[PDB]
């Protein structure tokens, strides 16, 4: 959720259009968004189209315009020179597709390949006019939409919901990494920042539920403190537990302690459940679901929720607010849990 | 005081004080913060979801004995309906289910005499996997249908040499409630499902009577105070369309802001008498006073 929040592009603010005064031509997906703003991940409510997310490879240039890397092909030879083009330059040239048949020598198998022409037009140009190619597929998607396996078998309507509902998942008491992922989980977990990563390589000296002490190759030592059962902005648990032992050697940039929804450094938002795809007696009728009682006995889908309560003592013109056990009109049975000073 | 509908252990207490020269907002002497924690299990009405937009609340939680179970006695954990898949065009969940079964059981492509054609462009060290193997299918370059079919055709037995899921990806289930086997094979596999932050325990609320507002004497709103559910304009149109005049009159007078009607009806209920007749709502009199404050001579005639 936080990583998705930090990579967000909202068209509404002081100096931008308004949710109640936005038409349908600004909520559309212009063909210039390819590689720069994800067409899937957007809110489903009355904010649909007014809030988007930055794609994986995009960067913002000094003037505030978004760019995407392209792999330039010189005389039919797909090079490895990456050049970042903004939408106008991408407009001038002709761009091929990433999943094209390269022949192990930077040469297309056939002459005819799908491309993108000036106004986003898709055509079949002989493979001699092609100027650029995408650095990869998964260049038009954002981080959250790149974690859906078999995304091209799902229609865009349901993929939007699948991407938007992954940032509403709650951390569970014990985390489990998916059996079938996409390879984006590790990068998204290490870049979000909820894990502890070894700053310098060395050997682990002490481990505990509260800290890890690393002994660096040159004299120095570093102790990493852990966040145990800490509340997040939305009232969930924020545990951190080590995944190294007292003798292991760690390297720079290595994950040294898990986080809320990580399983050994990879994002782990849910659990792997054995499923059947049958209708059963009308209890899974109209989008309803049937669960085994094992998932309750064995605490598979259990979560911890933490609450925060605040009070303060203030002077006031009359003066002297006090925190104390001596409260008027209160009995002792309702003053049993309180300690000696409130 | 801990507000309505909350409980749990006290895990932490953070107390600030001016005596210790802590930086507090001006005019504040002390500040104390208390943390209360709960552990919530999954229950009916909680919202679950997959990675392909297949959401849904939990309808029932069955005992482990009355669930469809495989030929070796393994019950299924979750049951999804068939009618939702083909109409929504999210067939990716079925392919995820198939590949999840293949990954759970582990496979071995038999290259006894030449690799099979479907496994020609399959990367090496994918020709065999151990049980509970973790794999990855990038978003637009992953597992083809032919490769999934081939992997399903070759998948390891569990403990005894029994293959529970056939080449189509379906299994013969037993009805754990009646005992007889289901007449046709069913699709089984492993799906990765998520628990969404839309739990029932934050959604359920009820009220007989409670706090009321100040300017207008209507009940408050929200669970943390107590508050009542709102009976809006559309719900009034619905009741006018039904023709139910007495239900509508009581809902708007002796349940909202008829200050004497409330106490009288409560007394009548507890004493077993007949519910009395409503009076005049207080919001109407507030309206009259505001209209008079705008220098308008509003008067009720007889």
């Amino acid at each position: 959720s936080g990583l998705t929040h930090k990579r967000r592009l909202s068209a509404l603010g002081p100096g931008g259009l308004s949710r109640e005064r936005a038409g349908l031509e600004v909520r559309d997906v212009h063909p210039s968004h390819y590689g720069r703003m994800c067409p899937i991940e957007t809110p489903e409510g009355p904010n649909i189209g007014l809030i988007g997310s930055l794609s994986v490879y995009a960067r913002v240039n000094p003037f505030g315009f978004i760019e995407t890397p392209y792999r330039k092909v010189v005389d039919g030879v797909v090079s490895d020179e990456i050049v970042y083009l903004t939408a106008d330059e991408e407009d001038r040239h002709v761009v091929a597709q990433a999943n094209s048949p390269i022949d192990a020598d930077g040469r297309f198998v056939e002459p005819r390949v799908l491309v993108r022409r000036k106004a986003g037009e898709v055509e079949y140009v002989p493979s001699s006019e092609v100027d650029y190619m995408d650095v990869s597929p998964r260049q038009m998607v954002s981080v959250a939409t790149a974690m859906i396996p078999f995304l091209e078998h799902d229609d865009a309507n349901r993929a939007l919901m699948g991407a938007n509902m992954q940032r509403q998942a709650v951390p569970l008491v014990r985390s489990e990494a998916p059996l079938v992922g996409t390879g984006m989980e590790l990068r998204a977990a290490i870049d979000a920042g909820d894990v502890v990563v070894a700053e310098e390589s060395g050997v682990i000296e002490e481990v505990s539920a509260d800290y890890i002490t690393v002994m660096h190759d040159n004299g120095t030592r570093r102790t990493y403190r852990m966040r145990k059962f800490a509340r997040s902005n939305h009232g969930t648990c924020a545990n951190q537990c080590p995944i190294v032992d007292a003798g292991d050697r760690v390297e720079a940039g290595q994950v040294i302690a898990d986080g809320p929804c990580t399983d050994d450094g990879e994002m782990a938002l849910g659990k792997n459940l054995l499923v059947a795809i049958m209708p059963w007696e009308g209890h899974n009728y109209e989008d309803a679901i049937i669960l085994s009682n094992r998932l309750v006995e064995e605490d598979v889908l259990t979560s911890i929720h933490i609450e925060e309560h605040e009070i303060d003592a203030r002077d006031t013109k009359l003066g002297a607010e006090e925190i104390t056990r001596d409260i008027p009109n209160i009995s002792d049975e309702v003053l049993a849990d309180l300690d000696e000073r409130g | 005081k801990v507000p309505h509908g909350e409980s749990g252990k006290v895990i932490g207490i953070r107390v600030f004080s001016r005596e210790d020269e802590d930086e507090l907002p001006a005019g504040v002497n002390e500040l104390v913060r208390v943390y209360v924690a709960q552990k919530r299990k999954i229950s009916d009405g909680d919202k679950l979801a997959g990675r392909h937009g297949n959401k849904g609340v939990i309808g029932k939680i069955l005992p482990v004995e009355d669930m469809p179970f495989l030929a070796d006695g393994t019950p299924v954990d979750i049951i999804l309906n068939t009618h939702g898949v083909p109409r929504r065009m999210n067939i990716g969940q079925i392919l995820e289910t198939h590949l999840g079964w293949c990954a759970h059981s582990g496979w071995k492509v038999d290259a006894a005499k030449g690799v099979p054609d479907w496994a020609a462009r399959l990367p090496d060290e994918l020709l065999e996997a151990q049980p509970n193997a973790i794999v990855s299918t990038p978003v637009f370059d992953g597992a083809q249908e032919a490769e999934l079919q081939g992997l399903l055709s070759c998948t390891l037995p569990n403990r005894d040499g029994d293959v529970l899921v056939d080449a189509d990806g379906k299994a013969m289930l037993f009805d754990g409630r009646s005992g007889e086997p289901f007449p046709y094979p069913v699709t089984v596999g492993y799906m990765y499902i998520m628990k969404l932050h839309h739990l029932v325990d934050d959604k359920i609320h009820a009220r007989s009577t409670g706090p009321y507002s100040m300017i207008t004497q209507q009940p408050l709103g929200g669970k943390a105070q107590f508050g009542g559910q709102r009976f809006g304009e559309m719900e009034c149109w619905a009741m006018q369309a039904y023709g139910a005049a007495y239900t509508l009159q009581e809902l708007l007078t002796i349940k909202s802001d008829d200050t004497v009607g409330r106490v009288k009806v409560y007394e009548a209920i507890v004493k077993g008498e007949n519910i009395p007749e409503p009076g005049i709502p207080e919001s109407f009199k507030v309206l009259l006073k505001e209209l008079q404050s705008l220098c308008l001579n509003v008067e009720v005639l007889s």
Binding site: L3, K6, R7, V56, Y57, R59, P69, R71, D80, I82, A98, N99, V135, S136, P137, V143, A177, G181, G183, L186, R187, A188, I190, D191, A192, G193, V250, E251, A252, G253, Q254, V255, D264, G265, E266 | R121, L122, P123, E125, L126, A129, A133, I134, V135, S136, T137, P138, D141, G142, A143, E147
Partner: peptide, 26 residues
């Protein structure tokens, strides 16, 4: 893949990507 202690998650990818994913908080 390029992290010193990442788990071994075998991929079905047929293509090879020249460019690594940038820093996602850049």
């Amino acid at each position: 893949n390029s992290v010193p202690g990442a788990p071994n998650r075998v991929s079905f990818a047929k293509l090879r990507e020249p460019l690594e994913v940038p820093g996602l908080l850049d």
